[PDB]
C-alpha cells in the first residue's frame, strides 16, 4: 500500500522543520497538501504544484511558513517558522488521483494520510 | 419477422417505442438544478421557503409556466468525489454559503475551489447564494473583526460599481470580491458564475429563472459561433 | 466552358458529402440537422439535374430539344430554387428560436415541427411552379410579343403582372424573414460580448448574409424591372444571373455545415 | 384474473345479436384477445382476433363481413358484433386471452361462455389419430397428433398446443410448444414430436384426468383444432 | 496506542517477507515461450437504441439472449439481443440509479443507486406487468453494485464502506462484512458462490467467506481507487481496474501480484474488467472514448474496440458468444 | 481507540498464518487450464458464418 511519515514543545518565537516520508506511489506525479488538526475541526494549510509551481497558503499562516518538497527523495516538509502561541498535530496528504487539479482530502480516515505527529508552542 | 407471434413481438416493441417518445418529449422540456451547501447555511430554509435513511430529496417548483428540478443530497458520507460524477450534466449548480460567521469561511472557499476545478464539472455554471445578510448587518456595526482572519482586510475599499453603513458594504463587497477572485481565475470562458446577496425572500425563483435563461442563452450563442 | 463544369462536380461532391455523413454518423440525429440534410437534398438534386441542360443552353444559345420539354425545365428549376430559398429562411427561424428565447428551444423544435417545416417548403413551390408554368398564367396578354421573341429558345419569360407577384412572394417573404431575425440577433450577441468582457458575430453574419445577397438580389431585381422597361436588357445577360443563382447553391452546404467545428469533428 | 360474458339467448335467423366479454383482475390493455367457438356435439373452432394496440385484426374464412370485433381498454371490454345470423351459428363462445413475448405462454386463461341457440382450402389440417381409449387409474397413457405440414420453423420452433378441457368446464392449458409445461399443471405429464407426428404421455392417472384432450397449431394464422380424445 | 501500532507494523512485516520468499519466478519468464494470440478484429452486430440519457450499467442472462440495462432517466428496459427487440420497460421509482443485475432463473432483476435502497422486481406474475416485490433498506451510502445468489440471497455493496448479504423473503440483514476504510465500489461473486471478492477506494481488495461472515486475504499494490473487478473462470484468480490506468492479475494461493497490464498511451482510468470463457483474453474499458483487448497472459495490446463518450460498462456471454458495451452517449453494442 | 487497534492486529495475525505455495506452479496451473479450454472460445478462435446467431 501507500505509507506517509511525518517527522517533526518549543518556545514562542521559535522556527521548526516538518517533513514527510513515502513511498510506494510515483512521488513525481501528485499534488501534496499538509492538514493539522488543533486541540477542533482539521484546517487546510498549504498545498503545492506537482513541479511546485502554485503554492498556497492560508492567511493565518501566510507570510510565516513555507512548503517545499524535492522529487529525489519522495519527500515533502515545510519550513515552520517564527512560531506562536499552534498547537495540533500536523498530517500529510495526498490527491486521490495522479493528475488532476481537483482534490478532496474529511474526517473518515481518508485513506492517503498518515498518522501524524504534534508539535508543542507553549512554555 | 415469418412467423404470427414474431410479428406480434414486433408490434409489442413498437408500442413500446411510442411510450418511450412520449417519455422522452415530456423528458426534453425540464430543466435539473444541484443544491449544494453546508450545515451552517440555510440552504434547508431556502428551500421551504420555495416549497427513513433516505439518501437524496427532491423539489419541484414552477415560474412562467417552465418546470425546474432542485435535488438536495441527504444521508451520505463526508466524501464527495465518488457521487458527484452523476451530475455532469444538470442547468447549474446552487450553492448557498453562510458569510456571518468569520471562521468557516475559507472551509466555504474551499469547498468553492473544490466544485469549480472538477474535471467532470466543468461547462456547469454556478449560482452563488450569500445567505444570512441580516445577521452580518447586525455584527458589523456593534463591533469580532475580520482583520485577523484575512490579513488584507485592511487594504481594501468598495469599488467604484458597487450599487449598495458603508462598512456594511464594504464587508459584503470583499466576501464577494474573494469569491469572484477564485471563480476567475480559471474557466477559459465555458462557465460563469452569478453572486447574489440573499436574506432569510419571495424572489429566489425569479432569480434562479433568470440566471437560467443567460446561461442557456450564453451556452447557445457559443455553440453557432456568434460570440 | 470548363469554368461551368467544374461548378457543378463542386455541387455534387459537396452536397453527397453532407447527405452522406448526417445520414450514417447516430450522433448527428437532432431535429436541426433534418432541415440540414433536406437542404443538401434538393441543393443535390438540382446540381444533378438542372445543371447539365442550362449548361447545354447557354453555351450554343440555341434550345435543342422538344417543346414540349422546356415546359418541364423551367418548372423544376423554379420549384428547386424556391425550395432551397424557403429552406434558408426557415433554418434563419430555427436560429432565432435558439437564441433570443432559451427556456422553451428544446420543446418547440421537436421534430414534428421539423418534419411540417420540410413538408411545407417541399410542397409549396412545386404546385406553385408548376401551376405557373403548364397552364399559361405568366403567359397573358404577352402572346404576340413572347412569340416574336420565342421564334428564335427557353427563358423565366414573365408578364407584367405575374413576374412581379412571383418575386414579391420568393425574393420578399423569405428576404424580409432572414434579415431581420439576422439584425436582432446580431444585436442580442454584441451585447452578450459586451457584457462578458466588462467581434466574430458580425463576422459570421455579415458573410452568410452577403453571400445570400450577392447571390440572389441582382437576377430578381433585373426580372421584376423587365417587363416595365420594355425587354431592354440582352437575352446572353440572364445566363449570368441564372449561373449567380446556381453559385448560390453551390457555395450553400459548405457555409452552412463546414464552418462549424462540430461537424468537422463528427467526420 | 376472472373473465365474463354476457349476451346469448335465443335469436331469430337473419337478426343481430351483440355479445360482450368484461375482464377485470390483470392489466387488459396488454393482452390479444380471441374468440373462440364450439359446437354443441363437436370440437373447438377459432373465429376472430384483436391484438393490444388494436393495429391488427384477423378473421376466420368462414365469417369475414359478418362478424365485427371491437375493444375499450378505458373500461376493460370485448365486443363481437354478429349480423344475419345464420342457422350455423348455433354455439358456445369463449373469451382467451393472449400475450406474446420472447418467452410468453398464449393461450393461458379461458373464460366460461355463453350459449347461443338459433332458431329454424389452403390452410393446415390437424387430424388426431383416435377419439376414445380406456385406461385404469394408475396406467401409462398416450394420445397422438397429426399434421398435415411441417409446424418447425426456420428460426427453431414447434409451435404447437394441447389443452384437454375437463367435461363440464372451459378449457385449460397443459402444453405450449411441444415441449413447455405450463405453471399450475402437476409435472406429470410430457410432450415430445418431430415436426409432423406429435405425442402426449401421461405417466401415472387420477380421476382428474378425465376428459377430451385437443391439439391445436399456432403456425399459421388460421387456426385449425383436433377433433378431441375422450379419456374413460 | 503506540504499542499496538508497533505490534501492527511487526505483523504486517511479517507478512510481506513470507511472500517476497514466495515469490520465486514471474509469470513473464514463464509464458514468454507461447506462440502469441496474434490480432483479434470484432465488428459490431447490434445497436441497441431507445435510452434517453446515458447509461451506467447492465447484465448479461443465463439463457445467453436477453439483457438488461439502465439509465439515468429512470428506466429499465430488458432486450431480445437476436431481434433487438424489447420486452419489458420498467419506471423505477429515483432516477440516480447506479447498478442492475438478473436473477440466475431469470425471475428477477434488481436496481439501486443515489437513495440506499435496493429494489426488486418480479417479472413473473399472473398480471401481465412487472411490479416491485421488495425493497431492501438499512444501508447508509450509495448502493454501487449487487449480485444475486440464488432467488432468495442478494449481495449488496454501499457506499459506507460495508457489504452485506441480504434475505428478500424477510428483508433483512443476515450478515455484514465490515473492515473496508473507503467506500466499496464493485463485487464478484464466484462460481461454486461460497467467496467473493471487492474493490474500494481505499487501493486494496479482501476476499469474503459468505457462509461465516469474515475476511479471509488483503491484496494491495494499486496506487489509487478501484473501479471494476472480474473474476478469474477457473476460481482462483481475479483482475482489477484502478484510476492509474493500470491493471493488476492476483492469485488466491500464492497471494501475491502477477503480470502487469499497462502502456504509456493511456492517462485516464478504467471503468470496467470481463475475462473471455477460457481466460485467454483479458479487455477492459477506458474514458478515452475507447476499448482495449489484452492478452490475458503476456501483457500484449491484441485488438481494440472503436462510441462517442465515456464507456461504463462491459460483459461477456456465458458461452462466450458475444460481448456487450455500454456507453454515456446512451447506445448499447453488441461486437462479436 | 483501542478497539480498532486491537481489531486491526487480531485481523493482521489472522491473514499471517496461511498455506502458501510457489508462484511457478500457479503460473504452470493457469497457462494449463487457458491451453486446455481453449477450443471452446468464440472469440478467441472465430467461429464460421453458420453456427452464430448474430450474423448480418
Ligand atoms: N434559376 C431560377 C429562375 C427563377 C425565376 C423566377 C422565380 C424562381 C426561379
Not at chain 4, 406474446?100 to 341457440?117: A, E, N, V
Request: charge should be neutral; include cysteine.
Amino acid at each position: 500500500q501507500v505509507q506517509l511519515q511525518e517527522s517533526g514543545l518549543v518556545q514562542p518565537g521559535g522556527s521548526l522543520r516538518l517533513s514527510c516520508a513515502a513511498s510506494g506511489f510515483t512521488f513525481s506525479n501528485y499534488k501534496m497538501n499538509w492538514v493539522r488538526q488543533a486541540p477542533k475541526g482539521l484546517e487546510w494549510v498549504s498545498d503545492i504544484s506537482q513541479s511546485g509551481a502554485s503554492i498556497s497558503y492560508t492567511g493565518s499562516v501566510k507570510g510565516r511558513f513555507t512548503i517545499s518538497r524535492d522529487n529525489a527523495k519522495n519527500t515533502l516538509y515545510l519550513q515552520m517558522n517564527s512560531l506562536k502561541p499552534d498547537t495540533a498535530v500536523y498530517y500529510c496528504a495526498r490527491c486521490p488521483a495522479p493528475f488532476t487539479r481537483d482534490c478532496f482530502d474529511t474526517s473518515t480516515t481518508y485513506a492517503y494520510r498518515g498518522q501524524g505527529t504534534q508539535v508543542t508552542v507553549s512554555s | 419477422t415469418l412467423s404470427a407471434e414474431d410479428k406480434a413481438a414486433v408490434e409489442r416493441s413498437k408500442m413500446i417505442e411510442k411510450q418511450l417518445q412520449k417519455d422522452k418529449q415530456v423528458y426534453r422540456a425540464t430543466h435539473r438544478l444541484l443544491l449544494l451547501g453546508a450545515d451552517n447555511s440555510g440552504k434547508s430554509t431556502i428551500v421551504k421557503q420555495m416549497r427513513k435513511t433516505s439518501g437524496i430529496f427532491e423539489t419541484k417548483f414552477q415560474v412562467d409556466k417552465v418546470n425546474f428540478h432542485m435535488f438536495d443530497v441527504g444521508a451520505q458520507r463526508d466524501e464527495r468525489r465518488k457521487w458527484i460524477q452523476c451530475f455532469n450534466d444538470v442547468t447549474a449548480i446552487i450553492f448557498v454559503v453562510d458569510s456571518s460567521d468569520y471562521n468557516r469561511l475559507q472551509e466555504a472557499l474551499n469547498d468553492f475551489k473544490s466544485i469549480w476545478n472538477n474535471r467532470w464539472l466543468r461547462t456547469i455554471s454556478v449560482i452563488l447564494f450569500l445567505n444570512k445578510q441580516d445577521l452580518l448587518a447586525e455584527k458589523v456595526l456593534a463591533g469580532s473583526k475580520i482583520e485577523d482572519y484575512f490579513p488584507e482586510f485592511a487594504r481594501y475599499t468598495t469599488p467604484e460599481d458597487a450599487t449598495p453603513d458603508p462598512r456594511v458594504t464594504r464587508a459584503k463587497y470583499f466576501i464577494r470580491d474573494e469569491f469572484l477572485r477564485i471563480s476567475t481565475a480559471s474557466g477559459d470562458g465555458r462557465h460563469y458564475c452569478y453572486p447574489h446577496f440573499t436574506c432569510s425572500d419571495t424572489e429566489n425563483a425569479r432569480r434562479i429563472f433568470n440566471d437560467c435563461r443567460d446561461i442557456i442563452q450564453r451556452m447557445h450563442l457559443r455553440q453557432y459561433e456568434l460570440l | 466552358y470548363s469554368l461551368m463544369s467544374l461548378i457543378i462536380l463542386a455541387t455534387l461532391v459537396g452536397n453527397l458529402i453532407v447527405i452522406i455523413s448526417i445520414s450514417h454518423f447516430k450522433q448527428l440525429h437532432t431535429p436541426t440537422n433534418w432541415l440540414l440534410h433536406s437542404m443538401a437534398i434538393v441543393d443535390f438534386l438540382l446540381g444533378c439535374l438542372i445543371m447539365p441542360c442550362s449548361m447545354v443552353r447557354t453555351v450554343e444559345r440555341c434550345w435543342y430539344f422538344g417543346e414540349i420539354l422546356c415546359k418541364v425545365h423551367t418548372s423544376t428549376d423554379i420549384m428547386l430554387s424556391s425550395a432551397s430559398i424557403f429552406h434558408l429562411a426557415f433554418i434563419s427561424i430555427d436560429r432565432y428560436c435558439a437564441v433570443c428565447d432559451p427556456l422553451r428551444y428544446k420543446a418547440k423544435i421537436n421534430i414534428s415541427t421539423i418534419l411540417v417545416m420540410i413538408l411545407v417548403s417541399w410542397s409549396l413551390p412545386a404546385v406553385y411552379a408548376f401551376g405557373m408554368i403548364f397552364l399559361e398564367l405568366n403567359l397573358k396578354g404577352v402572346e404576340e410579343l413572347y412569340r416574336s421573341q420565342v421564334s428564335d429558345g427557353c427563358s423565366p419569360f414573365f408578364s407584367k403582372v405575374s413576374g412581379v407577384l412571383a418575386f414579391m412572394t420568393s425574393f420578399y417573404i423569405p428576404g424580409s424573414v432572414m434579415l431581420f431575425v439576422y439584425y436582432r440577433i446580431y444585436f442580442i450577441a454584441k451585447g452578450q460580448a459586451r457584457s462578458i468582457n466588462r467581434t466574430k458575430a458580425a463576422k459570421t453574419l455579415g458573410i452568410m448574409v452577403g453571400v445570400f445577397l450577392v447571390c440572389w438580389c441582382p437576377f430578381f431585381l433585373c426580372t421584376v424591372l423587365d417587363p416595365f422597361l420594355g425587354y431592354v436588357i440582352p437575352p446572353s445577360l440572364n445566363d449570368a444571373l441564372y449561373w449567380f443563382g446556381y453559385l448560390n447553391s453551390a457555395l450553400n452546404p459548405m457555409v452552412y455545415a463546414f464552418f462549424y467545428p462540430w461537424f468537422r469533428r463528427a467526420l | 384474473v376472472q373473465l365474463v360474458e354476457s349476451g346469448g339467448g335465443l335469436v331469430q335467423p337473419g337478426g343481430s345479436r351483440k355479445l360482450s366479454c368484461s375482464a377485470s383482475g390483470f392489466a387488459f390493455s396488454s393482452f390479444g384477445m380471441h374468440w373462440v367457438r364450439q359446437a354443441p356435439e363437436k370440437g373447438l373452432e377459432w373465429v376472430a382476433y384483436i391484438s393490444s394496440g388494436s393495429g391488427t385484426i384477423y378473421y376466420a374464412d368462414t365469417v369475414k363481413g359478418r362478424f365485427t370485433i371491437s375493444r375499450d381498454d378505458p373500461k376493460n371490454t370485448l365486443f363481437l358484433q354478429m349480423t344475419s345470423l345464420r342457422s350455423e351459428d348455433t354455439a358456445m363462445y369463449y373469451c382467451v386471452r393472449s400475450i406474446y413475448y420472447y418467452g410468453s405462454s398464449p393461450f393461458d386463461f379461458w373464460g366460461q361462455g355463453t350459449t347461443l341457440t338459433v332458431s329454424a382450402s389452403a390452410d393446415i389440417v390437424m387430424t388426431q389419430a383416435t377419439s376414445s381409449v380406456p385406461v385404469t387409474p394408475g396406467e401409462s397413457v398416450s394420445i397422438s397428433c397429426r399434421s398435415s405440414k411441417s409446424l418447425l420453423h426456420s428460426n427453431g420452433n414447434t409451435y404447437l398446443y394441447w389443452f384437454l378441457q375437463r367435461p363440464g368446464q372451459s378449457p385449460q392449458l397443459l402444453i405450449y410448444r411441444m415441449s413447455n409445461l405450463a405453471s399450475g399443471v402437476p409435472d406429470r405429464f410430457s410432450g415430445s414430436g418431430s415436426g409432423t407426428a406429435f405425442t402426449l404421455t401421461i405417466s401415472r392417472l387420477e380421476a382428474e384426468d378425465v376428459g377430451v384432450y385437443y391439439c391445436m397449431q399456432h403456425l399459421e394464422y388460421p387456426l385449425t383444432f383436433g377433433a378431441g380424445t375422450k379419456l374413460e | 496506542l503506540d504499542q499496538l501500532r508497533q505490534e501492527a507494523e511487526q505483523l504486517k512485516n511479517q507478512i510481506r517477507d513470507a511472500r517476497k520468499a514466495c515469490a520465486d519466478a514471474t509469470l513473464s519468464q514463464i509464458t514468454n515461450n507461447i506462440d502469441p494470440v496474434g490480432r483479434i478484429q470484432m465488428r459490431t452486430r447490434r445497436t441497441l437504441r431507445g435510452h434517453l440519457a446515458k447509461i451506467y450499467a447492465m447484465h448479461w442472462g443465463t439463457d445467453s439472449r436477453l439483457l438488461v440495462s439502465a439509465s439515468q432517466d429512470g428506466k429499465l428496459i430488458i432486450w431480445d439481443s437476436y431481434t433487438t427487440n424489447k420486452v419489458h420497460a420498467i419506471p423505477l421509482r429515483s432516477s440516480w440509479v447506479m447498478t442492475c443485475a438478473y436473477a440466475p432463473s431469470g425471475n428477477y432483476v434488481a436496481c439501486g443507486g443515489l437513495d440506499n435502497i435496493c429494489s426488486i422486481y418480479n417479472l413473473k406474475t399472473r398480471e401481465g406487468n412487472v411490479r416491485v416485490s421488495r425493497e431492501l433498506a438499512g444501508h447508509t451510502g450509495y448502493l454501487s453494485c449487487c449480485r444475486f445468489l440464488d432467488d432468495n440471497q442478494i449481495v449488496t455493496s454501499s457506499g459506507d464502506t460495508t457489504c452485506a448479504l441480504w434475505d428478500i423473503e424477510t428483508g433483512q440483514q443476515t450478515t455484514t462484512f465490515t473492515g473496508h476504510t473507503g467506500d466499496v465500489m464493485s463485487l464478484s461473486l464466484a462460481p461454486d458462490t461460497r467467496l467473493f471478492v471487492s474493490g474500494a477506494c481505499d487501493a486494496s481488495a479482501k476476499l469474503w467467506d459468505v457462509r461465516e461472515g469474515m475476511c479471509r486475504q488483503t491484496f494491495t499494490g494499486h496506487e489509487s481507487d478501484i473501479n471494476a473487478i472480474c473474476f478469474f473462470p477457473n476460481g482462483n484468480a481475479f483482475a482489477t481496474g484502478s484510476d492509474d490506468a493500470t491493471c493488476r492479475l492476483f492469485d488466491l494461493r500464492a497471494d501475491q501480484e502477477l503480470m502487469t497490464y499497462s502502456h504509456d498511451n493511456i492517462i485516464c482510468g478504467i471503468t470496467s474488467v470481463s475475462f473471455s470463457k477460457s481466460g485467454r483474453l483479458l479487455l477492459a474499458g477506458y474514458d478515452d472514448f475507447n476499448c482495449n483487448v489484452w492478452d490475458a497472459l503476456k501483457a500484449d495490446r491484441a485488438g481494440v474496440l472503436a462510441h462517442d463518450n465515456r464507456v461504463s460498462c462491459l460483459g461477456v456471454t456465458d458461452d462466450g458468444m458475444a460481448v456487450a458495451t455500454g456507453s454515456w452517449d446512451s447506445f448499447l453494442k453488441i461486437w462479436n | 481507540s483501542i478497539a480498532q487497534a486491537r481489531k486491526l492486529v487480531e485481523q493482521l495475525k489472522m491473514e499471517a498464518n496461511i498455506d502458501r505455495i510457489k508462484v511457478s506452479k500457479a503460473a504452470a496451473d493457469l497457462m494449463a487450464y487457458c491451453e486446455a479450454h481453449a477450443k471452446e472460445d468464440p472469440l478467441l478462435t472465430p467461429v464460421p458464418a453458420s453456427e452464430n446467431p448474430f450474423r448480418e
